[PDB]
Amino acid sequence: MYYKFSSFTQKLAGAWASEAYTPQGLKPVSXXXXXXXXXXXXXXXXXXXXXXXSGKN
Amino acid sequence: LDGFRKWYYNAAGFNKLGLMRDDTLHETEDVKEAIRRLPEDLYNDRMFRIKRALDLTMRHQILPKDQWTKYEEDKFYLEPYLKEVIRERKEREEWAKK
Amino acid sequence: QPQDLEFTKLPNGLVIASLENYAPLSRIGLFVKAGSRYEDSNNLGTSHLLRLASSLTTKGASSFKITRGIEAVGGKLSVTATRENMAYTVEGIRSDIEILMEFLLNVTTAPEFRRWEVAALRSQLKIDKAVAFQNSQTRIIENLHDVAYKNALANPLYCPDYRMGKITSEELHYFVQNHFTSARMALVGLGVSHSVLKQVAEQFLNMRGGLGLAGAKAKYRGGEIREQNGDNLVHAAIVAESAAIGNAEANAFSVLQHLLGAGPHIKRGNNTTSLLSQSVAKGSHQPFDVSAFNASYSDSGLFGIYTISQAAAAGEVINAAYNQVKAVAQGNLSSADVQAAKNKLKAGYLMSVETSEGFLSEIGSQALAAGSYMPPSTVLQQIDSVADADVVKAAKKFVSGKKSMAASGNLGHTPFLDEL
Amino acid sequence: MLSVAARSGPFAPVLSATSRGVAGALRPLLQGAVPAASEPPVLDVKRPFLCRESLSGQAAARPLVATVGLNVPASVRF
Amino acid sequence: ATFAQALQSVPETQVSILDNGLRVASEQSSHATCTVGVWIDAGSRYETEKNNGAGYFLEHLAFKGTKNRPGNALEKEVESIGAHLNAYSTREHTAYLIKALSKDLPKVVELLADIVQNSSLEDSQIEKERDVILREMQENDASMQNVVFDYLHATAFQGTPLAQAVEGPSENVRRLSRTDLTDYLNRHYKAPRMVLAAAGGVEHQQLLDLAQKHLSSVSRVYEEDAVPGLTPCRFTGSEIRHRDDALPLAHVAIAVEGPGWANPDNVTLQVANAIIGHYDCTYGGGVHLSSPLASVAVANKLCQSFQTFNISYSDTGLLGAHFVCDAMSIDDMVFFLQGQWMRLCTSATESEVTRGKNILRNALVSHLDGTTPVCEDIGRSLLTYGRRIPLAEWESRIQEVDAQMLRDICSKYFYDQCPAVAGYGPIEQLPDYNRIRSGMFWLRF
C-alpha cells in the first residue's frame, strides 16, 4: 500500500494499494497465451472445402 | 488436370515462399477495396505472409518443402469479397450507362 | 375509398391500414416496436445505429441501388424514432410506389448488415449525436429519462460514447431478428390500395415469428442530476410519474399540460392564457421560458415543468412555477380556463392530423398501441369528456409524487429537490 | 492523525492531487501518458436567446423524437 | 388514378374582388381546420431608408393591442379559441396568418381585419418593442447564415432599396417614431395590395361575406396623391468578405442574377437547382448520393453542408449556392460547385434532367401538402403572378422542360456572368474574385 518494486530503478518505490498488494488483477478468467511462433511441428486446419471454393462462374 | 494444375502451381513459385494465390494477385483499386473489407485475422495473416515473402526474396531463399503451402489447402479468402466489389463496380458502371 | 379508413389485421399479428384519398403523393409507413426501449445494458445504441443503418446493403438491393433508385424516383425515405417505436416512411408518386415499397421492405426486413458498412457508419453515428446535442433540450430530456427510470426508458435515444466503436453487425442482426417481428409491425399507407398493401405484406412480412421479446416494465426511480456546463441560460426539468397511453388520467394530464402551457400560440407573444408563464412573469424582468412537459408511453408517463431561465433567477423561476402547479393542485382554477385548455388540445390534435406526415404518424401509432383506428371525432369527444376534477387529481398526483430533476447550466442558484 | 493521508489508507492518493512545479531528483512510478484522445467534431454555433420572445417556445413539452432521412437533414422534435 | 388525374382532382382555388379592390382567395379542403391569412405587398424594397424598419416594427406591434381590443385582449381571445397565430415579412411581402378551426371563421376574420386595419401603437409598447428588436438583431448577428444572406443581398443590390435588410439598421430602429409607423400603415397597407387567403375547411361564400362585412372599409386612396412606384433594382457583380478567424466554420454564398417571379425560366432553373442538390452532415446517402456535388463532398470530406437557393422578386433574383465548410475546403468547394454549374451549362443529360424533374415534382406536391403552405402559396401567388398557378400547369411546365432548354437557360444565366459573393468567417482560403470569374467560364467550351 506504501511500497512496490520498480524494474528500472531497482529500488522499492512508492505506489498505491491496488498495484502493491494486488499486482494480480481482478480479471475473472485467465485468458490463453499467443500462438507458438517458429514451431517445428505445424498442424494446419482445413477451412470449408477446396471443391466448394475455386469457382469462377 | 488436378495433377497438371498441381504441377503448374509448383512451377509458378509463389507456393515456395509460402504465399497464396489471393495473397499474390496484384492490387488494383477493387483489390485494395476488398482487402479493406477483409476481417482482422485474415488481414494480419495476409500481411505476415507478404512480409515473410519480402524477407525470403531479400535473402534469396525459400521455405522448406514441408513448410511450402499445398494445392489442397490453399484457401481462397479474398475471392468472395473481390467478386462482391466487382459486382458493385459493374452496377455503378451500368447506372452510369443509364 | 376516401369515405373511410380501411383497417384489418393479418393472422400473424400484422396490422394493415390504408386510405385511398387519391392524393398526388402516396406514402408507405412501417411502424416497428423496436425503439430504444427494448435494449438492455449490453447493446446500447443499437437502435440508433440501426436508424442510421436504414440505407445499407440488403439481401435483394445494394445500398447504392437503394439510394440511387429512391433519388431517381424523387421520393424520400425517412426514419422517425421515439423511445417506444421506429417508423420507416417512404413518400413518392403513385406510379413508383411499387418500387418504393420494394426498397422499403428490402431495407426493413432483410438487411445484410456488413461489418465494413457499420465500421464506416459509426463516425456518422458520432456526428449525428453531436448535431442532436447541439441544443440543450435534447440532453436535458435524455438525462431526465435516465434519472426517472431504472430500465427500458433510462436507455438513451442516442448512442453512448463508449458504445460508439463497439456495436457490431451481429448485435444489429440480433436486435432486428428479436424485435422486427410481425406482431410488433404495422404497415400503413396513404394513397395506396388495400389489395396492394396486403399483397406486399403477404409477400414480405409473413416470415416473422411472433411477439418477440417482452420488455422490462420501466420501473420508476426518481432522483436528480445537475450538469454544470456554463451556458448563458439554465435548463431545469422537474417531472413525476403519470398515466400511460390510453387512460382518462392521461387525457386529464394532457388537458392539464395545455392548461399550464404547452407552448406559444403567438409569435413574440406574452402567453396570457399560460398560467405558468403568467406566474413566472409576475415576479421577473428577465428572459425565460416555462412550459408543461408531458410524455406518455406504453406503461408509464412523465408529467412536469420545464424552465429555461437565467443563472441568478433560476431559483425564483422554478419556485414560482412549482407554486403555480401547487395552486392548480389545491384547486385555484376556473371552468373557463379548463374549456380554453380543452380547445387548445383539440386544435393541436386537429392540426397534427391536418398534414399527411402527422396523419400517417397518428394512424401508425394507433395501429401499434390500440390495434384499431380511433376517429378524430371520438378523440375530441373524450377530450371534451375530460373533467376539471380529473385535472385537479392529476395535478395532485404530480405534486405528491416522487420527483425527477434534470438540470444543466450554471447551477449556483438552482434549487435542489429537497429544497423545493 | 489529523490529516487525510493518515486518515484514509489506500484512498490518500485518490483524495489528494499531487503535481510538481519542477522535476524531482527521483523519478516516480506510473508516469502515465495521454494516448492521443480524439477531438469532438466542429459544428456551426447556435444562436443564443437575449429576449423572452426569442426564448419562448424553446421549452420542451413533448417526448423527444429523432428523425433521419436519406436526403433530409436530421431533426429533433421536443 | 395516376399523377395527372390526381393533380386534376386537386380542388381549384376561388378568387373574388371586393369593392375596394382587396383580393379574397380561398381553397376548400376536407380538413376540419383552416389557415386564414392576410398578405400585404410591402417590404424593404418599398421602404426608402428613412423607415427601413417600419414593417418589422409593425409586425412586432400588430399583436400588442388594437383600438377595439387593447393590450392583451386580442392575444387572450385567440388563445381562448385556441388558434395559432404567426407573422413574417420578406423583402417583398408581409404575412399575418392564423391557423384555426373551421367553426371559428368569423372570429378569425374579425381578428385579422382588426390587426391589419385598426392597429393601435402606444408609445410605451413602441419603446419596449424597440428594445426587443435591438436584442433580436443582436441574436440574428450571432446567427451566421442570416448574416451571409444579408451580405449577399447588400453586395448584389447595392445602391437600390433591395439591399437593405428586413430589420434595417440599428440607428434607424432606435430613431423611428409612431408617426413613421402610421405613415407606413397609411401608405403601404392599401386595399388592392392585400390578399385575404383562406385554405382548408372554408366556404368561399362565407369568406366573401365575412370580407364584405369587415374588410370593406380600407380606404385605398392616398392622402395627397402620394402613389408609390416600383422600380427595377440593378444587380451588381461584387464580393464582400467578413473575415473573423475566431469563428469555427466559414459560410460562403455565391449567386447570380435571377429571372424574377413572372419569368417562365424559373421552372427550368429550379430543375437545375434540383440537379445540383443539397447536402448536410446528417444525410444518410453518403458517397452514393445522386448529386455529384454531394458525392464528391462526402468522398473528399470537404464541406459541412451546402444548399442551392433561387430567391425571386419582381423582375429580380438571386440564384446560387450557400455552403458552410471549414477553412481548408473553401477553394475545393468553389471549384467543384463552379464545375457542376458549367457541367449543367455545357453537357446536360436526359437521365439526370428526368431525375431533377421528378425531384421538383415531389418537392412541389410535398410542400403543397398542408393547409398552411397552401394558404402561403395562394397569398404569394396572388401577390406575385396575379393568379394561382395550378398544379396541373406546374406539371405541364415540368413536362415542357427537357435537357436542351435546360442547357440553354443555364448557359444564359450562369455562363460568363459576374456573381455576387458573400463570405463570413475564416475565408482566407476563399478564392479571389478573378479566380471565381475564371471558374465561371470554361476554356474548353
Curated annotation (Swiss-Prot), chain C:
One Pfam family recorded for the sequence: Peptidase_M16
Chief location: mitochondrion
PROSITE patterns: INSULINASE (PS00143)
Cellular component terms (Gene Ontology): mitochondrial inner membrane; mitochondrion; myelin sheath; nucleoplasm; respiratory chain complex III
Listed GO MF terms: metal ion binding; metalloendopeptidase activity; protein-containing complex binding
Record's subcellular location: Mitochondrion inner membrane
Alphabetical UniProt keywords: Acetylation, Electron transport, Membrane, Mitochondrion, Mitochondrion inner membrane, Phosphoprotein, Respiratory chain, Transit peptide, Transport
Protein name: Cytochrome b-c1 complex subunit 2, mitochondrial
Organism: Mus musculus (Mouse)
Swiss-Prot record, chain D:
Entry protein name: Cytochrome b-c1 complex subunit 9
Superkingdom of source: Eukaryota
Function according to Swiss-Prot or TrEMBL: Component of the ubiquinol-cytochrome c oxidoreductase (cytochrome b-c1 complex, complex III, CIII). UQCRFS1 undergoes proteolytic processing once it is incorporated in the complex III dimer. One of the fragments, called subunit 9, corresponds to its mitochondrial targeting sequence (MTS). The proteolytic processing is necessary for the correct insertion of UQCRFS1 in the complex III dimer, but the persistence of UQCRFS1-derived fragments may prevent newly imported UQCRFS1 to be processed and assembled into complex III and is detrimental for the complex III structure and function.
Native organism: Mus musculus (Mouse)
Subunit field text: Component of the ubiquinol-cytochrome c oxidoreductase (cytochrome b-c1 complex, complex III, CIII). Subunit 9 corresponds to the mitochondrial targeting sequence (MTS) of Rieske protein UQCRFS1. It is retained after processing and incorporated inside complex III, where it remains bound to the complex and localizes between the 2 core subunits UQCRC1/QCR1 and UQCRC2/QCR2.
Signal peptide coordinates: none
Swiss-Prot record, chain E:
Modified residues (Phosphothreonine): T179
Residues annotated with N6-succinyllysine modification: K128
TM spans (from-to): none
Modification after translation (UniProt): Acetylation of Lys-103 is observed in liver mitochondria from fasted mice but not from fed mice.
Alphabetized GO MF terms: metal ion binding; protein-containing complex binding; ubiquitin protein ligase binding
One BP term from GO: mitochondrial respiratory chain complex III assembly
Tissue/organ expression: Expressed in neurons and astrocytes of the cerebral cortex and hippocampus (at protein level).
Localization per Swiss-Prot or TrEMBL: Mitochondrion inner membrane
UniProt entry tagged with the keyword Transport: yes
Keywords on record: Acetylation, Electron transport, Membrane, Mitochondrion, Mitochondrion inner membrane, Phosphoprotein, Respiratory chain, Transit peptide, Transport
GO cellular component: mitochondrial inner membrane; mitochondrion; myelin sheath; respiratory chain complex III
Residues carrying N6-acetyllysine: K76, K103, K128, K213
Pfam families (UniProt xref): Peptidase_M16, Peptidase_M16_C
Knockout-associated phenotype: Results in early embryonic lethality.
Phosphoserine found at: S177
Membrane topology: Peripheral membrane protein
SUPFAM superfamilies: LuxS/MPP-like metallohydrolase
Subunit structure: Component of the ubiquinol-cytochrome c oxidoreductase (cytochrome b-c1 complex, complex III, CIII), a multisubunit enzyme composed of 11 subunits. The complex is composed of 3 respiratory subunits cytochrome b, cytochrome c1 and Rieske protein UQCRFS1, 2 core protein subunits UQCRC1/QCR1 and UQCRC2/QCR2, and 6 low-molecular weight protein subunits UQCRH/QCR6, UQCRB/QCR7, UQCRQ/QCR8, UQCR10/QCR9, UQCR11/QCR10 and subunit 9, the cleavage product of Rieske protein UQCRFS1.
Function: Component of the ubiquinol-cytochrome c oxidoreductase, a multisubunit transmembrane complex that is part of the mitochondrial electron transport chain which drives oxidative phosphorylation.
Family (UniProt): Belongs to the peptidase M16 family. UQCRC1/QCR1 subfamily.
Protein name: Cytochrome b-c1 complex subunit 1, mitochondrial
Provenance organism: Mus musculus
Gene: Uqcrc1
